Amino acid sequence: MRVVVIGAGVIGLSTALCIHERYHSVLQPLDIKVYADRFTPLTTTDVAAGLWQPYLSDPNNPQEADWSQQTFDYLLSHVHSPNAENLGLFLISGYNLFHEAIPDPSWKDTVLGFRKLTPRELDMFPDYGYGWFHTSLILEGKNYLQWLTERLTERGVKFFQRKVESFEEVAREGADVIVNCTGVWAGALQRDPLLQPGRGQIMKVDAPWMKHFILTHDPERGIYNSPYIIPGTQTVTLGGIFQLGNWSELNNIQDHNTIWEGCCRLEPTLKNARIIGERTGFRPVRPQIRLEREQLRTGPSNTEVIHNYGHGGYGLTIHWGCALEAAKLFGRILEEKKLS
Amino acid sequence: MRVVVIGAGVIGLSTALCIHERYHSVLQPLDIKVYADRFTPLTTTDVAAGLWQPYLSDPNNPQEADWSQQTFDYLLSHVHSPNAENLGLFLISGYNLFHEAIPDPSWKDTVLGFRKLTPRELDMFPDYGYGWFHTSLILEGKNYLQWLTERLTERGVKFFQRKVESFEEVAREGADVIVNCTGVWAGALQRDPLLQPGRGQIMKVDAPWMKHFILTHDPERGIYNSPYIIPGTQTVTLGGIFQLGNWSELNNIQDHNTIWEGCCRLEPTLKNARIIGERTGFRPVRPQIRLEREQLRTGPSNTEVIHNYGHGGYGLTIHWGCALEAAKLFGRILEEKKLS
Ligand SMILES: Cc1cc2nc3c(=O)[nH]c(=O)nc-3n(C[C@H](O)[C@H](O)[C@H](O)COP(=O)(O)OP(=O)(O)OC[C@H]3O[C@@H](n4cnc5c(N)ncnc54)[C@H](O)[C@@H]3O)c2cc1C
Ligand SMILES: Cc1cc2nc3c(=O)[nH]c(=O)nc-3n(C[C@H](O)[C@H](O)[C@H](O)COP(=O)(O)OP(=O)(O)OC[C@H]3O[C@@H](n4cnc5c(N)ncnc54)[C@H](O)[C@@H]3O)c2cc1C
Secondary structure, eight states: OEEEEEOOSHHHHHHHHHHHHHHHSSOTTOEEEEEOSSOTTSSHHHHOOOBOOOOSSOOSOHHHHHHHHHHHHHHHTTTTSTTHHHHTEEEEEEEEEESSOOOOOSTTTTSEEEEEOOHHHHTTSTTOSEEEEEEEEEEOHHHHHHHHHHHHHHHTOEEEOOOOOOHHHHHTTTOSEEEEOOGGGGGGGSOOTTOEEEEEEEEEEEOTTOOSEEEEEOTTTOTTOSOEEEEOSSSEEEEOOOBTTOOOOSOOHHHHHHHHHHHHHHOGGGTTOEEEEEEEEEEEEOSSOEEEEEEEOOSSSOEEEEEEEOOGGGHHHHHHHHHHHHHHHHHHHHHHTSOO | OEEEEEOOSHHHHHHHHHHHHTTTTTOTTOEEEEEESSOTTSSHHHHOOOBOOOOSSOOSSTHHHHHHHHHHHHHHTSTTSTTTTTTTEEEEEEEEEESSOOOOOSGGGTSEEEEEOOHHHHTTOTTOOEEEEEEEEEEOHHHHHHHHHHHHHHTTOEEEEOOOOOHHHHHHTTOSEEEEOOTTTTGGGSOOSSOEEEEEEEEEEEOTTOOSEEEEOOGGGOTTOSOEEEEOSSSEEEEOOOEETOOOOSOOHHHHHHHHHHHHHHOGGGGGOEEEEEEEEEEEEOSSOEEEEEOOOOSSSOOEEEEEEOOGGGHHHHHHHHHHHHHHHHHHHHTTTTOO
């Protein structure tokens, strides 16, 4: 079999790797290609801070809940391992803040040592009245992409820097199975109106002492529009911007100020911090992760599609569970092509 | 009314700073001046990471528990302060790891959100079977001294670098009150058998993805002789050395390997971090911290001396509670020339 994986981002490569390993033995000519328009230092997966944390409420798909959990376990089972450094993986604890009470999550047991905030801690953040504290994981995308690649290279997966214009284009030229892991730009390959870019702008600042992450939440501002502070590895991440259908990949001076003024008030130790950089990204926002098969129709023979897009603000967080599901379905494509 | 402080350690500098900040207004002739043999970077303080954590067992003079409490409350009310970054202050969470079940401390209700560890967390550390988790503070010496330095210099205080040979020597030139902060080298000023140095070595290393502290305990080989990893502000601190009566102030090759071999087994990710510095200090070990007031005999009439030394491996932890008692003691003296 010949396999083509469009998309060289976290979703795309995790899959390519996870499809390889699993069916490397039970398939003679398993030849995986990756096509993509922007590689590892230039994707939406790079803009992400990579903090493990799914939506605050149940998604339409509870098949999703298990997925983010699946990633977390795999990740934590490799935090205290040599690779972890190359992976951009490590533990990180922090505050989740609200303006009022609110039910627990779902990942409640998934995350490590989940517990409610205490009065005495709340004091440190005047503007808020209720919140949480727990231990999670950060999977930095720049080290993850880099690692996944080297992993995929030794496996023999080749990479090509081409903008696919159509599944047919690839089918018609030899593709047996096509994995669409093309995120927020999946639209151009197949009109999807439920897939919108929730615009993200962030700030990378040098403030080492920051050791705890601080996501806040206010209903009037909106999902990921409430300020957050995620100390990464070599720098700490300011951010808190969410804007649907704003395909504007460019830093906004007015956003800058709402991130700055916003996070400062949260932790004024920040005011005399240092701005290393400012970046913009698009959360592939969609009601529920598109993870399913499709039957594209051509000249002679029909070719399968495995769609893997729309993870929005929780890409890194749910990546594996999905990349490991997509492989699941890929084995179903083989049983059907009768091979075994 | 001349005051002479000897020792520009955390104890010296902090005490010398309350005596002023809290009396400069009530004494037209208030003269504070500190003498020291070793300044800013060459004190024991400098070798300390500065993690606020007393001893597991209760303090001997039950007043100390109260002083630590005072420290963590003055520190915690300034964690988000305009100066928090200067003082070298920041919150930080982490693990204690015991081999067996072991009673709670007593400061449990003074740190931020104490609690036992779940078994999934104990899976991070195979060698161990039981532990604690909580948020705390780090007061880096290298910067906490430099802070107190400037606060003092603008407050009129003067620093002179000289190796005081005797108490008389100071009295002779007109020391009305002498506040002794000599710490470990206190012995050679007024013989003390109970004040011993527990020599300590550490290792500063480059591993930014460290976010929690990991203090292991191993009663096998006594106090502090178990690895620990305290992430600093610029660099992470390895270590786990307690050696009583060792006045050797030079790094040891077998200590280096103990610091390394031993720390890595805890956090294997460390097996790759770059080594930045190795230093050595002496913990002012003494059955119970010498904070009192003695009437020092000097020829004709007297010259007052306040003792404040022997703060074990928890100088920083309790530094403040003392600097505030000692000024209280500087009050009782000031009320015996019978002044309002
Ligand atoms: C500010 C911000 C903060 C975030 N923080 C977090 C966080 O803390 N935790 C978290 O889990 N997630 C976070 N995310 C989001 C997360 O990073 C993404 O959801 C995850 O990267 C989606 O994987 P992906 O879709 O980005 O793969 P992508 O990066 O979208 O893959 C894109 C690649 O596919 C290629 N491609 C697309 N279409 C075609 C085509 N037609 N032909 C050829 N190639 C094509 C593109 O050229 C591109 O190179 C954040 C996002 C933003 C914007
Ligand atoms: C390896 C190590 C790790 C540690 N980690 C921690 C930690 O995480 N948290 C914590 O709280 N504590 C820690 N400590 C210990 C803690 O830092 C010390 O207890 C605290 O620094 C004591 O303040 P001090 O008494 O040393 O002031 P000092 O450093 O004792 O003041 C010393 C100064 O006084 C001068 N002096 C003394 N006698 C005279 C004299 N006769 N004339 C003139 N000058 C004189 C000296 O020359 C010197 O300049 C650690 C210690 C070590 C060794």
